[PDB]
RNA sequence: GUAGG
């Protein structure tokens, strides 16, 4: 409950404003939002848990760590 | 000793309809039930259960049993 | 007294979506301990 | 401690050979032990007697055809094992058969020897075309339960002789079912219904009496360890 | 074993772990990823030390510790406090008297925890076989040993309150003197009118005796005659006492009272408030839902006696029976793998100098020697392969009489319970975590 | 339906011990079965007492005699399995014999026939007998799921690595710009569709009919072969977003 | 054909585990006999157990006593599996008392005459110096498992609390069958039953009790006919 | 509002 991110709220994507595109997963939700757990009810894909290693940017974006690889 | 105790097919053939049967059995059951609720005023128009009766029972089962035995009859006005 | 009185009296079981007319079906009741209805497997697929 | 209500076996008869038997309410979880043990013991423990080998005149074991009879050997084996006998010699005995002319040899045409009897004579055995030519000789011996037909080298002794499946059990089948019942507001009671289909040789109740005595002995064997009491009725 | 499961079934499984309820006694998973410890410690429910000291006195109500600096800290463990959803939040005590402490160490469990490791359920023995039609279309069959040992039992606390509001006609009174009731119903009530602590209640009982100030009464002629014949007085005050709700049972554990004229402040108008707790111990019975971690869920359908369960060769009964028809259709093969590994965790494995590929992998990883009962960790995507499971099944430690009860295929021979004869072919058996 | 199919199944469903014998009647068959020599799946000769209607297709054939014989209503011997005899005993006596697999379609067909040609109470009684017998024999079947029950085909790795080699060659010849990206994607679709179809066929050939999954998918109980394909074979092409 | 009556022999593998052999049984007869013996030896055996208790200064089973590190429910779970042998039909009373730092154990229980506790090493709880525990126990006899709710007979005594109890001493019974060395087509089977039971009683006694029950019930089946 | 169907 603490970590969940909700797209529903004031000045945002409401229940009836939902579409096919927003709900589905995106190639960018990798290490920033787990694609598996979401409510399986009508509000499918409008709620999502934060990734395991996720972190917040001061602006409000989500970052993820990556190990640095050099010369193979 | 069950809801399906009288097989339906015999009832259907005598009645000729799946709806005429229910209306006719229900009218007979109403008459029997009101007779059992007479409590002694003894109206002559009412009649008792033709077939023997248990100490506890529902009038509709007795009605359907009479239909299967065929002792009753119906006549549309 | 309850076990005596329920018999030869049909009760209509029904499921919520009730897509087609097999959604509501009559049964002859029967007492049983616990707090969960018991239903006949064969008719289960008709209700979905 | 004591069981609330004692059971009481009783009998319902639908036919002179088929019968059904009900045990009045019994402790929860006790129906299945009784049902399965009774089925097994009735099916095997009860003794009896039946044929063990048959011999056809002028026929080889590989030669399945028998001259003078429209019927084959396979149906003949079926018919003879279908027949019932009653013997008490406790050793092999030989029964004979020699009939000629056309017609139908049945189980009323048998001539058992002393101490061996065929309870029912009404089985039709063989229909003959032309000359009967029928001559058979078989062996009878008491046994227990069921024994499948197995070679015993008698074919080398006499080519005509072959084993036949033997049914020493005087009963044919037993089917037991346990169903719940409600007593004193409580539904945790079970009634055992045993359906015994035996042949006309023995009455089913006598067979069950013998079975019950066998089980009583076999489980009273356990009492030798020590003496203990359990609440009953 | 998440990689094996489908997407939908892992979705359902994750959605279900949030709905488990804590039990009377918790036990950590024998098979499960190695991260549960962190997800338990970081959660607030556990009670972890904040100094690296030594414990002096240990008691259920409170644990007293002292640091080397000199600060004495005594932590209060919550007992049976109602949670938001209505479940107990009992906390147990782990640390012994003389044990040392490093900062941050867990000192007491929360709900659904054991040694600081998450435990939402219990690990049962399970076999896959249809059984008389009592597990038809996802249903579940399990022994009565669960009902007997309180393996699956949960406390539940209901709180209900009443307010001695004041109205236009006058003030309400909570008191023992209730009108128009028998004397026996007012047997557990205190003189103040509040039920005692520990007095069991049932549907229709009386908890706190409140009476309305007055209602405008215009008595009917029949009531007047009956009263005159019986010589009773229909007094203006009316009974409006709180009763236990229908279908609710329990034993009262706690009652709290707030009063206006006392220092405590209540909303305007109300003179007194009384809240009463009723706590019961619900055992697993027919109709209760049950589910595992891989999206396999069903309602209990029959609790058969202990003997009717098909019992393995040594005589151990199987605690739960699951339909196999679900597994290929629902595409969640992982549950099957887990079961075998679960068995492997119950009876330990010995592998030294075997020199096979999986043997070498286990030796380098360090998971070569294990005793029975020790847990195992298979991270979500670094989990064990099938060759390792097969090799371990081939080399399980002998449990009794120097024999292995499970075949190398992973199945075992099950004797029937009711009929008594062995089943035609071996059946798959092992341990599974159930919530 | 799994239990019924396990009942009226052709041989090889197990090791057919003691096959080919002739038995006096069904009763002796169950006694032999209890003895353990006979198997529920084994072709044997069975007699039937009077009153047993013979198979629908058995009406032309009959026994051999010089006198008129009406096997529509009297004794006759057949070659069948013991389980077929039990299954026929479940059905009403007036109903002719059946000597084939019931599965899911044929069972629906005979149920439709019963519902058409019989009063309702009889239909309900036979449905209940079928329920009880099916549950019991499904218990007896012993179907399960375990690590070794689902085995990947051995040929998968070779064929898939060959197709990987071909794909690598096409990627190499794309790296030189000889083929456009859109065209490269188009041919990769074709080749991998071929590869997944081929591995599906190989998996279908591998699995016997005694495997627990094959039993519960073939019988019509529950399951479809694509789910099996992606349980034991490579899942293959997956649609991207949008 | 050959008639051979059952004959029993015994053997001990541990003190409270044993193996019993019955050789001449019929074909397909060892399994059924073993299953029947197992079912009756697990279902119905007399025994003794605690059925209700009473803590001083406690009104319900949910609270926590001062001095213990285990609450009352934990003590119920710890006492539930305590095994006791009782000879009195009527209920009997035991009392537990402990003070100071240590660990209360079953060995500490004060035994009335004719009632005994068979697992002294079992630890019930533990106490610190400030702690104090005082408890009453009602011990009864019966067979099987009875829930606390059915046991509860006294609404008035708030202090008394019922506990569910499991009287039967048996743990687990498993049977195995073999093929007789005799040269017969029937292939008679030798049944061998391994029984292991709690510390309450010797298995021999339990099997004798099982035999009593079985022979009584089979005789009931038999006598009424003919 | 959020769960289960």
Method: cryo-EM
E379 CA to H1 C1' in angstroms comes to 36
Q: Is the CB of E302 under 7 A from strand H?
A: no
How do strand E297-304 and strand E140-143 relate by DSSP bridges?
parallel
E-strand ranges in G33-107 read 47-55, 84-86, 92-99
- G19 and G52 in a single domain? The answer is no
DSSP assigned state of E382? S
CA triple C3-C8-C13, angle to 5 deg: 90
Tokens 């609790």 found at: E303
Looking up residue D58, the CATH number of its domain turns out to be 2.170.120.12
As for how many domains chain G has, the answer is 2
CA triple G100-G105-G110, angle to 5 deg: 90
**Can you tell me the distance from the alpha carbon of F183 to that of F195, in angstroms, rounded to the nearest whole number?**
19
Asked if residues E176 and E191 have their Cβ atoms less than 8 Å apart, the reply is yes
E-strand ranges in D17-145 read 18-22, 47-56, 86-87, 93-99, 103-106, 116-117, 124-128, 134-144
Token output for E143: 């022994």
Q: Which of E238, E236, E234 is nearest to E209 (CA)?
A: E238
User: Domain ends where: G144, G167, G190?
Assistant: G167
For A33, list phi and psi in degrees, rounded to 5: -150, 125
E-strand ranges in B1-77 read none
Q: Which of E217, E240, E216 is nearest to E165 (CA)?
A: E240
Pairs across C and E, CB distance < 8 A: 13
Asked if residues D114 and D149 have their Cβ atoms less than 8 Å apart, the reply is no
Asked if residues G189 and G27 have their Cβ atoms less than 8 Å apart, the reply is yes
For D52, list phi and psi in degrees, rounded to 5: -135, -20
**Can you tell me the distance from the alpha carbon of F130 to that of F135, in angstroms, rounded to the nearest whole number?**
8
G97 to chain E, any CB pair closer than 8 A? The answer is no
User: Domain ends where: G167, G182, G203?
Assistant: G167
Chains G and A lie in contact, requiring 3 or more CB pairs less than 8 Å apart: no
G112 to chain F, any CB pair closer than 8 A? The answer is no
Token output for B1: 């000793």
Other CB atoms closer than 10 Å to residue G14's CB: what's the count? 8
Q: Which of F208, F153, F132, F139 is nearest to E325 (CA)?
A: F139
CA dihedral E196, E200, E205, E206 (to 10 degrees): 10
Tokens 């111990």 found at: E281
**Can you tell me the distance from the alpha carbon of E24 to that of F196, in angstroms, rounded to the nearest whole number?**
51
Contact E57 G173 (CB under 8 A): no
How do strand G84-86 and strand G17-25 relate by DSSP bridges?
unpaired
DSSP assigned state of G110? P
Q: Is D147 helix (H, G, I), strand (E, B) or coil?
A: strand
Q: CA dist E428 to E414, F14, F82, Å?
A: 9, 19, 28
Token output for F117: 């040609």
**Can you tell me the distance from the alpha carbon of B3 to that of G134, in angstroms, rounded to the nearest whole number?**
61
Bases along strand H below 7 A from a protein CB: 1-5
Q: CA dist E79 to E111, E157, E280, Å?
A: 11, 12, 15
Q: Is C47 helix (H, G, I), strand (E, B) or coil?
A: helix
Q: CA dist G129 to A48, E97, E330, F66, Å?
A: 52, 12, 58, 107
Q: Is D181 helix (H, G, I), strand (E, B) or coil?
A: strand
Tokens 């809240």 found at: E275
Q: Is B34 helix (H, G, I), strand (E, B) or coil?
A: helix
User: Domain ends where: G167, G186, G215?
Assistant: G167
Token output for E386: 């099938």
Q: Is the CB of A12 under 7 A from strand H?
A: no
**Can you tell me the distance from the alpha carbon of G41 to that of G100, in angstroms, rounded to the nearest whole number?**
43
- G156 and G196 in a single domain? The answer is no
C1'-nearest nucleotide to the CA of E12: H4
Q: Is E85 exposed, middle or buried (0-12, 13-18, 19+ CB in 10 A)?
A: exposed
Asked if residues E422 and E415 have their Cβ atoms less than 8 Å apart, the reply is yes
Chains that touch G (3 or more CB pairs under 8 A): D, E, F
E277 CA to H5 C1' in angstroms comes to 32
- G103 and G40 in a single domain? The answer is no
Q: Is E59 helix (H, G, I), strand (E, B) or coil?
A: coil
Partner residues linked to G52 by β-bridges: G138, G162
A46 CA to H1 C1' in angstroms comes to 14
Partner residues linked to F37 by β-bridges: none
Partner residues linked to D126 by β-bridges: D105
How do strand E250-259 and strand D86-87 relate by DSSP bridges?
unpaired
Q: Following DSSP, what letter does each residue of E155-222 receive, concatenated? A: EEEEEEEEE--B-SS-B-EE-S--SS--TTGGGSB-TTSBBPTT-EE-TT-EEE-EEES-------HH
Looking up residue E236, the CATH number of its domain turns out to be 2.40.50.150
Q: CA dist A65 to A32, B17, G102, Å?
A: 10, 77, 52
Tokens 């509860």 found at: G152
Q: CA dist G28 to A26, F14, F102, G11, G41, Å?
A: 64, 21, 31, 24, 21
Q: Is C42 helix (H, G, I), strand (E, B) or coil?
A: helix
Token output for G172: 């687990």
Measured between CA atoms, how close is A39 to chain E, in angstroms?
7
Token output for C10: 């049909």
The range of the structural domain enclosing residue E183 comes to 153-283
**Can you tell me the distance from the alpha carbon of E305 to that of E319, in angstroms, rounded to the nearest whole number?**
11
Asked if residues E53 and E68 have their Cβ atoms less than 8 Å apart, the reply is yes
Contact partners, residue E76, CB within 8 Å, separation at least 6: E61, E62
- G56 and G155 in a single domain? The answer is yes
Task: Tell me how long chain A is.
Answer: 72
Q: Which of C17, C25, C26, C27 is nearest to C48 (CA)?
A: C17
SS (H, E, C) chain F: CHHHHHHCCCCCCCCCCCCCCEECCHHHHHHHHHHCCCCCCCCEEECCCCCCCCEHHHCCCCCCCCCCCCCCCCCCCEEECHHHHHHHHHCCCCCCECCCCCCCHHHHHHHHHHHHHCCHHHHHHHHHHHHHHHHHHHHHHCCCCCCCCCCCCCCHHHHHHHHHHHHHHHHHHHHCCCCCHHHHHHHHHHHHHHHHHHHHHHHHHHCCCCCHHHHHHHCCCCCCHHHHHHHHCCCCCCCCCC
Tokens 């009774």 found at: D38
Helices F156-175 and F181-206 cross at an angle (nearest 10°) of: 170
Partner residues linked to F14 by β-bridges: none
DSSP assigned state of A51? P
Q: Is B77 exposed, middle or buried (0-12, 13-18, 19+ CB in 10 A)?
A: exposed
Contact B3 C10 (CB under 8 A): yes
**Can you tell me the distance from the alpha carbon of G151 to that of F145, in angstroms, rounded to the nearest whole number?**
43
Task: Tell me how long chain E is.
Answer: 435
Q: Is G92 helix (H, G, I), strand (E, B) or coil?
A: strand
b/e sequence A27-63, b meaning 16+ C-beta within 10 Å: eeeeebbbbbbbeeeeeeebebbbbeebeeeeeeebe
Asked if residues A2 and F218 have their Cβ atoms less than 8 Å apart, the reply is no
Q: Following DSSP, what letter does each residue of E29-44 receive, concatenated? A: -SB--TTHHHHHHSSS
**Can you tell me the distance from the alpha carbon of A20 to that of D185, in angstroms, rounded to the nearest whole number?**
58
C1'-nearest nucleotide to the CA of A9: H1
Q: Is G19 exposed, middle or buried (0-12, 13-18, 19+ CB in 10 A)?
A: middle
Contact partners, residue D146, CB within 8 Å, separation at least 6: D43, D44, D166, D167, D168, D169, F31, F32, F35
The range of the structural domain enclosing residue G124 comes to 47-167
Q: Is B25 exposed, middle or buried (0-12, 13-18, 19+ CB in 10 A)?
A: buried
Q: Following DSSP, what letter does each residue of A3-26 receive, concatenated? A: S-EE--STTS--STT--HHHHS--
Token output for E257: 């009272």
Cβ < 7 Å from strand H, C residues 9-48:
16-17
- What is the separation of C-alpha E130 from the centre of its chain, rounded to a whole number of angstroms? 28
Q: Which of F129, F117, F121, F89 is nearest to F8 (CA)?
A: F89
Q: Which of E324, E347, E339 is nearest to E431 (CA)?
A: E339
Query: Looking at chain B, which residue has its C-alpha nearest residue C9?
Result: B3
Measured between CA atoms, how close is G217 to chain E, in angstroms?
18
b/e sequence F221-237, b meaning 16+ C-beta within 10 Å: bbbeeebbbebbbbeee
C1'-nearest nucleotide to the CA of E18: H3
DSSP assigned state of D172? E
**Can you tell me the distance from the alpha carbon of E376 to that of E32, in angstroms, rounded to the nearest whole number?**
7
Token output for C33: 């301990």
Among the partner-chain residues C5, C8, C26, the one whose CB lies closest to the CB of B61 is C8
**Can you tell me the distance from the alpha carbon of G137 to that of G95, in angstroms, rounded to the nearest whole number?**
6
Measured between CA atoms, how close is D28 to chain C, in angstroms?
15
G27 to chain F, any CB pair closer than 8 A? The answer is yes
Q: How far apart are the first and last CA of chain B?
A: 35
- Helix or strand run (H / E) with residue E251: strand E250-259
| H-assigned helices in chain G | 30-43, 72-80, 148-151, 203-223
Q: Is E223 exposed, middle or buried (0-12, 13-18, 19+ CB in 10 A)?
A: exposed
- G135 and G209 in a single domain? The answer is no
Q: Following DSSP, what letter does each residue of B48-67 receive, concatenated? A: --SS---SS--HHHHHHHHH
Token output for D210: 């013998």
Query: Looking at chain C, which residue has its C-alpha nearest residue D188?
Result: C33
Q: Is G132 helix (H, G, I), strand (E, B) or coil?
A: strand
Q: Following DSSP, what letter does each residue of E253-313 receive, concatenated? A: EEEEEEESSSS---SSS--EEEEEEEEEEEEP-TT-EEE-SSS-EEEEEEEE-STTSPEET
Q: Following DSSP, what letter does each residue of E134-146 receive, concatenated? A: TT-SS-EEEESHH
E373: left (phi over 0), alpha (psi -120 to 50) or beta: left
**Can you tell me the distance from the alpha carbon of D144 to that of D128, in angstroms, rounded to the nearest whole number?**
35
Q: Which residues in chain E have Cβ-Cβ distances shorter than 8 Å to D36?
A: 418-420
Measured between CA atoms, how close is C48 to chain F, in angstroms?
15
Q: CA dist G9 to E315, F214, G38, G112, G173, Å?
A: 21, 48, 17, 37, 17
**Can you tell me the distance from the alpha carbon of G108 to that of G96, in angstroms, rounded to the nearest whole number?**
7
How do strand E242-243 and strand E289-291 relate by DSSP bridges?
unpaired
- G142 and G70 in a single domain? The answer is yes
Contact D74 F47 (CB under 8 A): no
For F113, list phi and psi in degrees, rounded to 5: -60, -45
Q: Which domains does chain F have, with CATH numbers?
A: 1-141 (1.10.274.100), 154-242 (1.10.132.30)
């Amino acid at each position: 409950h603490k970590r969940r991110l909700n797209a529903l709220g004031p000045g945002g994507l409401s229940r009836e404003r939902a579409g096919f595109e927003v709900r589905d997963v995106h190639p960018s939700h990798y290490g920033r939002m787990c694609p598996i757990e979401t409510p399986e009810g009508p509000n499918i894909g409008l709620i999502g848990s934060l990734a395991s290693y996720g972190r917040i940017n001061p602006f409000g974006f989500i970052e993820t760590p990556y190990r640095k690889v050099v010369e193979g | 000793e069950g809801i399906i105790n009288p097989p339906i097919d015999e009832l259907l053939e005598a009645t000729d309809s799946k709806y005429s049967l229910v209306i006719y059995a229900a009218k007979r059951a109403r008459q029997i039930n009101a007779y059992y609720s007479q409590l002694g005023e003894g109206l002559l128009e009412y009649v008792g259960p033709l077939v023997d009766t248990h100490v506890h029972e529902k009038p509709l089962s007795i009605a359907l049993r009479e239909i299967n035995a065929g002792l009753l009859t119906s006549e549309a006005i | 007294v309850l076990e005596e009185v329920i018999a030869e009296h049909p009760v209509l079981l029904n499921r919520a979506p009730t897509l087609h007319r097999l959604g509501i079906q009559a049964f002859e009741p029967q007492l049983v301990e616990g707090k969960a209805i018991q239903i006949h497997p064969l008719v289960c697929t008709a209700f979905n | 401690m004591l069981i609330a209500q004692r059971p009481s076996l009783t009998e319902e008869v639908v036919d002179e050979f088929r019968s059904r038997f009900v045990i009045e309410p019994l402790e929860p979880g006790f129906g299945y032990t009784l049902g399965n043990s009774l089925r097994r013991t009735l099916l095997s423990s009860i003794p009896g007697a039946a044929v063990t080998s048959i011999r056809i005149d002028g026929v080889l074991h590989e030669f399945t055809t028998v001259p003078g009879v429209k019927e084959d050997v396979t149906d003949l084996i079926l018919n003879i094992k279908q027949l019932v006998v009653s013997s008490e010699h406790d050793e092999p005995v030989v029964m004979y058969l020699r009939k000629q002319g056309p017609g139908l040899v049945t189980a009323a045409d048998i001539a058992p020897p002393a101490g061996v009897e065929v309870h029912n004579p009404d089985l039709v055995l063989a229909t003959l075309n032309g000359k009967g030519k029928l001559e058979m000789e078989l062996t009878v011996e008491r046994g227990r339960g069921y024994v499948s037909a197995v070679q015993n080298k008698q074919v080398g002794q006499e080519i005509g002789r072959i084993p036949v499946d033997s049914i020493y059990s005087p009963v044919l089948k037993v089917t037991y079912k346990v169903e719940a019942t409600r007593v004193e507001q409580r539904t945790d009671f079970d009634k055992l219904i045993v359906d015994v289909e035996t042949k006309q040789a023995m009455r089913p109740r006598d067979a069950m009496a013998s079975a019950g005595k066998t089980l009583v002995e076999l489980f009273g064997l356990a009492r030798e360890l020590n003496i203990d009491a359990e609440g009953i009725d | 074993f998440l990689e094996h499961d489908d997407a939908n079934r892992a979705l359902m499984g994750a959605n279900m772990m949030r709905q488990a309820v804590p039990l009377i006694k918790s036990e950590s998973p024998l098979v499960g990823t190695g991260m549960e410890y962190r997800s338990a410690a970081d959660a607030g429910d556990v009670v972890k030390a904040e100094k690296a000291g030594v414990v002096q006195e240990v008691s259920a109500d409170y644990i007293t510790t002292t640091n080397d600096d000199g600060t004495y800290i005594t932590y209060r463990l919550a007992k049976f406090s109602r949670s938001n959803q209505g479940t107990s939040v009992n906390q147990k005590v782990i640390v012994a008297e003389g044990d040392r402490i490093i900062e941050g160490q867990v000192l007491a469990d929360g709900p659904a925890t054991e040694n600081g490791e998450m435990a939402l359920g219990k690990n049962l023995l399970v076999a896959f076989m249809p059984w008389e039609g009592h597990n038809y279309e996802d249903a579940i069959i399990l022994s009565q040993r669960l009902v007997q040992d309180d393996v699956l039992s949960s406390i539940h606390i209901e709180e209900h309150e009443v307010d001695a509001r004041d109205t236009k006609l006058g003030p309400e009174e909570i008191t023992r003197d209730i009108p128009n009731v028998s004397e026996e119903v007012l047997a557990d009530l205190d003189e103040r009118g509040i039920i005692r602590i520990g007095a069991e209640v049932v549907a229709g009982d009386i908890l706190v005796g409140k009476v309305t100030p007055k209602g405008e009464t215009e008595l009917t002629p029949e009531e007047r005659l009956l009263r005159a014949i019986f010589g009773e007085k229909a007094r203006e005050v009316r009974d409006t006492s709180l009763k236990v709700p229908h279908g609710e049972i329990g034993k009262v554990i706690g009652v709290r009272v707030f009063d206006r004229e006392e220092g405590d402040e209540l909303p305007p108008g109300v003179n007194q408030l009384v809240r009463v707790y009723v706590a019961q111990k619900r055992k697993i019975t027919d109709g209760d839902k049950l589910a595992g971690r891989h999206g396999n869920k069903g309602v209990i359908s029959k609790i058969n006696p202990i003997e009717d369960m098909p019992f393995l060769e040594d005589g151990t009964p199987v605690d739960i029976i699951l339909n196999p028809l679900a597994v290929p259709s629902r595409m969640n093969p992982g549950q099957v793998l887990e079961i075998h590994l679960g068995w492997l965790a119950s009876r330990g494995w010995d592998v030294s100098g075997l020199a096979e590929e999986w043997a070498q992998r286990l030796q380098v990883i360090g998971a070569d020697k294990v005793e029975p009962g020790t847990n195992v960790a298979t991270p979500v995507f670094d989990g064990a392969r099938e060759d390792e499971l097969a090799g371990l099944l081939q080399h399980t430690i002998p449990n009794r009489d120097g024999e292995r009860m499970v075949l190398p295929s992973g199945k075992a021979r099950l004797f029937d319970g009711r009929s008594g004869e062995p089943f035609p072919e071996p059946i798959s058996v092992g341990y599974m975590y159930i919530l | 339906v799994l239990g019924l199919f396990f009942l009226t199944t052709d041989s090889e469903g197990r090791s057919p011990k003691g096959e080919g014998r002739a038995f006096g009647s069904s009763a002796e068959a169950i006694m032999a079965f209890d003895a353990g020599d006979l198997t529920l799946q084994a072709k044997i000769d069975i007699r039937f007492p009077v009153g047993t209607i013979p198979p629908r297709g058995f009406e032309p054939p009959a026994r051999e005699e010089g006198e008129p014989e009406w096997q529509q209503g009297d004794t006759f011997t057949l070659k069948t399995t013991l389980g077929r005899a039990l299954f026929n005993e479940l059905l009403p006596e007036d109903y002719p014999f059946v000597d084939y697999e019931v599965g899911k379609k044929q069972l629906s067909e005979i149920v439709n026939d019963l519902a058409e040609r019989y009063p309702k109470v009889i239909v309900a009684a036979t449905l209940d007998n079928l329920k009880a017998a099916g549950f019991f024999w499904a218990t007896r079947s012993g179907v399960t799921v375990a690590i070794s029950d689902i085995v990947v085909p051995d040929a998968k790795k070779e064929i898939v690595k060959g197709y990987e080699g071909q794909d690598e060659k096409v990627q190499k010849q794309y790296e030189r710009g000889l083929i456009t990206k859109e065209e490269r994607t188009q041919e990769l679709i074709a080749i991998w569709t071929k590869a997944t179809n081929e591995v599906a066929e190989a998996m279908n050939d591998n699995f016997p009919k005694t495997n627990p999954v094959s039993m519960m998918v073939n019988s019509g109980a529950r399951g479809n072969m694509m789910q099996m394909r992606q349980i034991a074979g490579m899942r293959g092409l997956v649609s991207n977003a949008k």
